[PDB]
Amino acid sequence: ECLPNSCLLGVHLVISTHSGPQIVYHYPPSNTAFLTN
Amino acid sequence: ETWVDIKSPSIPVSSEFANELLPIRWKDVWPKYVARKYSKWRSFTTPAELPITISDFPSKDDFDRNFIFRNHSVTLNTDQEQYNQTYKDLLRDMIYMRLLTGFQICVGRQVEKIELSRTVVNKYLDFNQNDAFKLYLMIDSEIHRITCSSSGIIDVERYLRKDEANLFDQVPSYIPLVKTRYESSFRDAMIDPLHVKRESLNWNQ
Amino acid sequence: NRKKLLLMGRSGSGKSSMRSIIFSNYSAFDTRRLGATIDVEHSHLRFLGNMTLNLWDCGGQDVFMENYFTKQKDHIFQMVQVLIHVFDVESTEVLKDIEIFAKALKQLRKYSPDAKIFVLLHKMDLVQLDKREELFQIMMKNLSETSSEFGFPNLIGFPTSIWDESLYKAWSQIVCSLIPNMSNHQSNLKKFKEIMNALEIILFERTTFLVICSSNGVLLDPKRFEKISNIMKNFKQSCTKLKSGFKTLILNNNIYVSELSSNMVCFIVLKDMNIPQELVLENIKKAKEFFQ
Amino acid sequence: EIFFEEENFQDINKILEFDNDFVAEFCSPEREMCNTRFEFTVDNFCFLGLPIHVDSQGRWRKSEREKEDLGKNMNMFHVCFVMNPHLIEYNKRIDDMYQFVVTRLSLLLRYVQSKTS
Amino acid sequence: DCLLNRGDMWVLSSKLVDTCVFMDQRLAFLDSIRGTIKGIYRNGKKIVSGYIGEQTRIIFRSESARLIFLIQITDEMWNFEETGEQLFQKMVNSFFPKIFKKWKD
Amino acid sequence: GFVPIHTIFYSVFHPTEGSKIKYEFPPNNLKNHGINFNTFKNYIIPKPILCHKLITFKYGTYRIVCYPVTINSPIYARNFFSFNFVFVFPYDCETSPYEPAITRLGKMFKVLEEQNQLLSKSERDPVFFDLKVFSIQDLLMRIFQDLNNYSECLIPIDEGNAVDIKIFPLLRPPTTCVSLEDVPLSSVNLKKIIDVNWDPTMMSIVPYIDGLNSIAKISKLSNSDPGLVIECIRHLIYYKCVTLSDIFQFSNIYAPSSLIRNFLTDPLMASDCQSYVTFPEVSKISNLPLNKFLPTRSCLFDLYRSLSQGQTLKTWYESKYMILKENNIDIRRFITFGLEKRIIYRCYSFPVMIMPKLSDEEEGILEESIRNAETFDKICVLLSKPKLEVESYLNELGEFKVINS
């Protein structure tokens, strides 16, 4: 398919401190139903 | 009619007539407006019995085209009134025995239309308030109407649907080979599946 | 104020049972349905209103245990405040348990040698009552000879089980080693004890119902703190049935259990039975902002 | 603004029917699976990124006091993109996204973390 | 777990007239037959409680009933679907276990 | 092509010694090739949020596909039994066709484990069980060898269970921009492919596919709704059998493409072009005047390049009619061979705005077609009228111009 479509849904910033892994920032807070459809 | 004649499979559905493609006898198990997408697993997990009520009835022309007429008149003898059995108990027992064979009690608009073109049709049966009951029952083979009054002379009129050119004689004999669980060779079936049918009972006796 | 607690042991040692009962509010009968912890399970639990506890419920099985001391050794054992090693007395591989503990102590000495080591001899309800304490001695001496070998001159141990109240004492003494400003709490508790003329004042935590401090630090039961903690956990679970939360409890006008703040519960046993309830309640309300 | 409408919003603690703790766990690989591609697929959901992990020393790359504490305590950062390519175009979309977006962005982030945190 | 005749269903419905019911109400017939009102419908709405009148289409679904299965063994059973599954593999690996799990649930 | 499997191994969660490789074929392949089951062991045996899902990740140069399964029952020790049938492929391939097979294998073995504990009891160890209330290696060998050799397997594991795998290629979904003015061709003979399982509509569409019938014409001829014909044509495109083309008229603007040199560089294109474009006999159409023995390949190449962007087929045919009469060339076949080989294309006509009284529906669809800038072909198809009548109707409706693109 030559039609451009960057099938992206979101980004996560996951850092691993010595107190355990954690998520600092994820941009789209929408659910799976809106994002996939 | 047991089938609808589609003109071509390549033509689409006309409006939303697919929802009208429902059995008449099992039409009352579905709700008035709830969509059919919910009652899918309920048919598998919890099968539904055949409802007591039926909401369809032949029109005026159908009773004058292919039907016949009979007449009963039943009243219990003085032997059964030695026990606590009046005419209402006989009517309840007769409706009970009309059922258990496939009969369905008719209440709705078409039955009232047929009754007027001949007062109150009944679905249940209460002996306390009412004292005269009239109710119809319907199977594809025949249609019964049972009427009663204070006189105790219970009247039953049965309209038998006449068979169409002996369909059970126009089909070839078909005897398959049946192997049950305890058998080891494919023996021959002892009944013709095609030529066994629910026979019309002699309701007078 | 982040405190990194490690909870290590062998397979089936009951680490997740302790974590569920003490913090996640599970009953003793509800720990049988627990599954096997895979790798390390992190739990961020808020203690008081300022402390946060990063509890690391480690796996305990052989592949995980061999993975801890080879590849993840630079991650699990750095910036560690308290290690809690859970020894099962039902284990038939006691020497392997001691060797695992020795490797853990070696890693902690290598990376964060300022930590505190605690050992809990769990499942000490299957053994008979006559041979419990001696068994707790018999292992502990050996563990001391292990614990002094890899640094760590001191090692505190507790005979624990989920079917009695010893778990509350063990976890209370483990947690209280991390609570800041303990001297100020002790001094304020002594001042309040002198002011109200109370026989004994004990300060808990509201959620976990663990003992934080006591006024004293007629002969009384030495294990009364853990028994009161268990009784209060049972009473909280009972009051959850009435669709509400426990607030106050007055026994014989002598024992007052009151919500001192949003993070502490006070248990005051006084001396005079003739004090009206409102005076004690008012003095409790005056000290509500003092301990904050 | 459509991502914050009432019919199109989810809690911050949940990412695609997964909690933040579990996502932060399984999007944080070991040392052997870091500093390379992390093409992870669960079910029509490709978690793709280039995790950057500290070396044996405290070096990120080779040539308020909570901020310095987190700088000295952090050992890995990962920028994870969630993709849903169709099954017939997986090997094209994932490859071009990794080649054109993720690699350069993560390398620049590693460089800027190495010089001035 | 009880055999009600068709006329028994008729009589039980006749006793449930001018009587209001609600969801999961365990009715009793002849002190041994147990019922369960698992659904009351009115104007397309599943109401929690309802009134049963003379024109209420009460249905009697059976939770313990006889079932017949007729499996067609044809040339198509060993054919493959578009995903890559045989049809009898779907029948013996996905249909029957799911229906038995649902029946037990 | 299908990628061969590199290593297949069966992993199980032991309640004492942890997750481990219970069986593996080929033997000592992971250790020899560098794959370590201490880095990704948390994905093979995961926490029950990733279970019953198709976990596919990348380890170095190897793409690892798995469907982990966790069963919850009090019979097993620690209330759980976790396993995984893990397949390893080289990274530079397409693991798409093997994914449904792996998913179905995991689901089938989960069903069997829930049914009669076929996998838990095969370990012959009572440590997997509560204790208070078939060879896997041969199966793995057979799966590996049969999927590498035959892309199929019918491996029996019991008296009623068999691992039954066939690997199908993945095909692209067809276009959605198929319309009523597109004629369908057929690169395959659709007569011999029809069997008893076809759709009833697709049976009727097949006789009316000859490279010159429009989809509306097929729908009216076979008494079919155009939507189902559209779906059937889409299904035929999905299998790479039917390719669309344009309606052939004598008012079209056919033009050479960038692949006209293929008429010289393909050694087998001109030779078929000589036989294709010629009438079987000396046809009468090659004897009508303009107004009142096979063709040379140079003649055909000169006739292909004579078309231009603006010269309609009528003007070109009346400008070259002695050549198409002496050589006995069918012009429709001449155009269709060029369109099939993609050496000439069609310049569509667009009526952009600037007689008998047609009915309200016809004028409504006329206005709707004009507002959407539809071609003359679609308007002619919808109104069932030729180009001249449509042009007269449009000029009656308003001023307009024709773009030949």
Ligand SMILES: Nc1nc2c(ncn2[C@@H]2O[C@H](COP(=O)(O)OP(=O)(O)O)[C@@H](O)[C@H]2O)c(=O)[nH]1
């Ligand atoms: N009888 C008894 N069982 C215990 C005790 N502590 C733990 N268990 C058992 O341990 C099992 C759960 O162990 P778990 O916490 O998952 O072990 P871990 O995964 O290594 O932390 C439960 O089934 C409990 O029955 C105890 O003191 N007494």
Ligand SMILES: [Mg+2]
């Ligand atoms: Mg655990």
